[PDB]
Amino acid sequence: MIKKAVLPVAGLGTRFLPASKSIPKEMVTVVDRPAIEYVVREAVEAGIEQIILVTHSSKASIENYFDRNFELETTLEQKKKFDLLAEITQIVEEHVSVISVRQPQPLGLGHAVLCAKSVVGEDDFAVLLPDVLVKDGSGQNDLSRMISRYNSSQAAQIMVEAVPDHLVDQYGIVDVAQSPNEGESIAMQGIVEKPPVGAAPSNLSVVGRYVLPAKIMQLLENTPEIQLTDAIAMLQDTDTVEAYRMQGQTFDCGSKLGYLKAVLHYGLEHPKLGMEFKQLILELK
Amino acid sequence: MIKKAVLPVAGLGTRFLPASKSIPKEMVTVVDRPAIEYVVREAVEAGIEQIILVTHSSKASIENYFDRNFELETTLEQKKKFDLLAEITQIVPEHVSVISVRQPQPLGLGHAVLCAKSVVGEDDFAVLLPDVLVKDGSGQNDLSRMISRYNSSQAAQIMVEAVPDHLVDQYGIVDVAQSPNEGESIAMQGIVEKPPVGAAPSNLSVVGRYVLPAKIMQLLENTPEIQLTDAIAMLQDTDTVEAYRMQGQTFDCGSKLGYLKAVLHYGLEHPKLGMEFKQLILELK
Numbered sequence: 001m002i003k004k005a006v007l008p009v010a011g012l013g014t015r016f017l018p019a020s021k022s023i024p025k026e027m028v029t030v031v032d033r034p035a036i037e038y039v040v041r042e043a044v045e046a047g048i049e050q051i052i053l054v055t056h057s058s059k060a061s062i063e064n065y066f067d068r069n070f071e072l073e074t075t076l077e078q079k080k081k082f083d084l085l086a087e088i089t090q091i092v093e094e095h096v097s098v099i100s101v102r103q104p105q106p107l108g109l110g111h112a113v114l115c116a117k118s119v120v121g122e123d124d125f126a127v128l129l130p131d132v133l134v135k136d137g138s139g140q141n142d143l144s145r146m147i148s149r150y151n152s153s154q155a156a157q158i159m160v161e162a163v164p165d166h167l168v169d170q171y172g173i174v175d176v177a178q179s180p181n182e183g184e185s186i187a188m189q190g191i192v193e194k195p196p197v198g199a200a201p202s203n204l205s206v207v208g209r210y211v212l213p214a215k216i217m218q219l220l221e222n223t224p225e226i227q228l229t230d231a232i233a234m235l236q237d238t239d240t241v242e243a244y245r246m247q248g249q250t251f252d253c254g255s256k257l258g259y260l261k262a263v264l265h266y267g268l269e270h271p272k273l274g275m276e277f278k279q280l281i282l283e284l285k
Numbered sequence: 286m287i288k289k290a291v292l293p294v295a296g297l298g299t300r301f302l303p304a305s306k307s308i309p310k311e312m313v314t315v316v317d318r319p320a321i322e323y324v325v326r327e328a329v330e331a332g333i334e335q336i337i338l339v340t341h342s343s344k345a346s347i348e349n350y351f352d353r354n355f356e357l358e359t360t361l362e363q364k365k366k367f368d369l370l371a372e373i374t375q376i377v378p379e380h381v382s383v384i385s386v387r388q389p390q391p392l393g394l395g396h397a398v399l400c401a402k403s404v405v406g407e408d409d410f411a412v413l414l415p416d417v418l419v420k421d422g423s424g425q426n427d428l429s430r431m432i433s434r435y436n437s438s439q440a441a442q443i444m445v446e447a448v449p450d451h452l453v454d455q456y457g458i459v460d461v462a463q464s465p466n467e468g469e470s471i472a473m474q475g476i477v478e479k480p481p482v483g484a485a486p487s488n489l490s491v492v493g494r495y496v497l498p499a500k501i502m503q504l505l506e507n508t509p510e511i512q513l514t515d516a517i518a519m520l521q522d523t524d525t526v527e528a529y530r531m532q533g534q535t536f537d538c539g540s541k542l543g544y545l546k547a548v549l550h551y552g553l554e555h556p557k558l559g560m561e562f563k564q565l566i567l568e569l570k
């Protein structure tokens with residue numbers, strides 16, 4: 001049914017400096033692999049086949065990480081380290097493509113999703129902000145559940161999560177009737193940015209996953225900084241727009257500090273490293 | 286007056302994979318800055334004025350990180366974001382030069398140091414392996430100690446530190462008459478590579494920190510593909526060579542568990558993130 005994700009990655013990482021001065025912020029080493037691995041893996045594990053990096057002139061280290069490296073592949077072999085060889089050989093599944101198009105000047109996410117117009121054609125497509133990680137535990141991920149909900153309903157979906165009632169000013173917060181349950185959706189007439197700490201419509205924050213149709217690109221070319229939330233504003237005129245509520249847990253790798261938080265959570269959960277890792281903490285006082 | 290330092294960064298970090306598949310294992314972000322910054326910030330602290338990168342074609346990221354980034358610099362005086370701009374200009378004093386030389390083929394540590402002969406000229410010099418981070422809390426880092434000691438003694442200095450008797454076959458370890466006290470040096474008759482767990486002349490791992498006479502250049506052009514501990518022998522005939530035991534802590538950012546250990550110990554002491562980070566940690570158990 002749904003098989004194109006668009007991943008915007010043209011962002012200068014200003015807040016993630018100097019780490020992101022010379023490499024991209026998408027390649028930040030979370031435990032033992034770059035951040036963009038987990039965001040793609042999420043998409044792959046959901047039923048996506050075609051990844052679409054909207055990318056910048058400087059983020060070639062990204063496209064390259066989904067591709068065969070001759071020089072390494074051949075040194076690994078001469079070492080006889082073939083386990084490790086078969087890591088780098090099969091990062092994505094053999095039946096997944098990774099595509100590039102260029103956001104020429106960085107004029108915000110909305111202008112970035114619009115750069116995929118041509119690759120997305122008439123297909124209904126998800127988005128994933130890769131500066132945000134998501135950690136399902138259930139077994140089936142939040143993008144999995146969200147999509148099947150966009151297959152059933154035909155309503156553009158918007159992933160959101162509950163925050164403390166005293167921190168709703170940091171977040172774009174969705175409007176709704178009542179708050180739908182962990183891993184369900186309910187209609188929504190619009191998102192408010194940094195609402196007043198009282199007088200906020202909901203305690204549910206735009207996370208930065210979306211499943212939209214192609215209508216949306218025609219709208220992006222007519223939004224009076226081009227706003228995605230402006231385009232979903234116009235979609236509402238014609239089409240039902242719901243809020244899919246997470247069951248798992250997000251991480252803001254866009255920020256130095258939500259990055260450190262992510263290293264702790266995934267590191268402890270690392271199939272090999274976790275054991276030896278949990279030890280390295282304990283050992284600290 | 287030791288004022289030059291060969292940083293060999295031509296490796297392919299197979300041991301630190303796939304982190305370092307598409308970015309150097311030196312550009313790997315410890316807390317908020319890549320790993321190599323800590324090594325240079327160490328070399329500069331100890332009097333170095335010329336940083337000689339023996340590098341590979343996979344590794345512009347590095348040379349660039351020590352350069353003007355034109356889009357970031359000019360974009361951040363648009364936003365008059367003076368604090369973030371601060372974060373990517375001061376990286377090393379105006380007087381510190383960073384010079385690239387290319388290691389065509391990875392035919393050994395030995396063979397890297399010798400690609401820099403051309404540039405080191407007739408002049409005694411230091412060698413710093415980035416794989417390895419060193420941490421002071423003494424107010425004179427281990428390298429400046431070693432350069433105080435080459436200057437007064439005139440005798441080459443091998444930084445070593447002690448390891449459990451049962452991992453000695455994972456290291457070069459040195460032939461010493463006795464163990465030099467944390468912070469001092471003693472003559473040594475030679476080093477061994479990976480001496481079987483029994484036949485180790487000492488517990489002291491060669492760490493990855495050398496001060497050397499510039500005529501080692503001339504003994505690397507004639508060794509039994511080229512090994513340093515080889516050339517440090519041939520000196521060991523003509524001249525005195527001393528093992529300096531280190532007083533500060535040590536982290537291998539070529540091993541995974543070693544990089545994770547550093548994210549923790551460095552991060553807990555970060556000016557800003559430190560107090561906020563420690564917090565994240567107390568919040569897990």
Ligand SMILES: O=c1ccn([C@@H]2O[C@H](COP(=O)(O)OP(=O)(O)OP(=O)(O)O)[C@@H](O)[C@H]2O)c(=O)[nH]1
Nearest residue numbers: 008009010011012013014015106107108109254
């Ligand atoms: O013009 C833009 C803005 C943002 N984006 C993409 O949208 C996502 C959101 O990116 P962020 O909003 O976290 O910011 P940024 O990376 O542009 O830089 P800072 O504000 O942290 O300094 C990132 O993955 C980025 O690549 C673009 O592709 N183009």
Ligand SMILES: O=c1ccn([C@@H]2O[C@H](COP(=O)(O)OP(=O)(O)OP(=O)(O)O)[C@@H](O)[C@H]2O)c(=O)[nH]1
Nearest residue numbers: 293294295296297298299300391392393394539
């Ligand atoms: O022949 C050599 C050996 C070492 N080095 C320099 O030593 C440093 C790392 O030494 P390593 O031995 O860790 O390099 P590697 O990246 O090949 O990793 P392994 O999988 O072999 O463990 C790097 O900074 C590299 O440039 C060379 O440049 N050439």
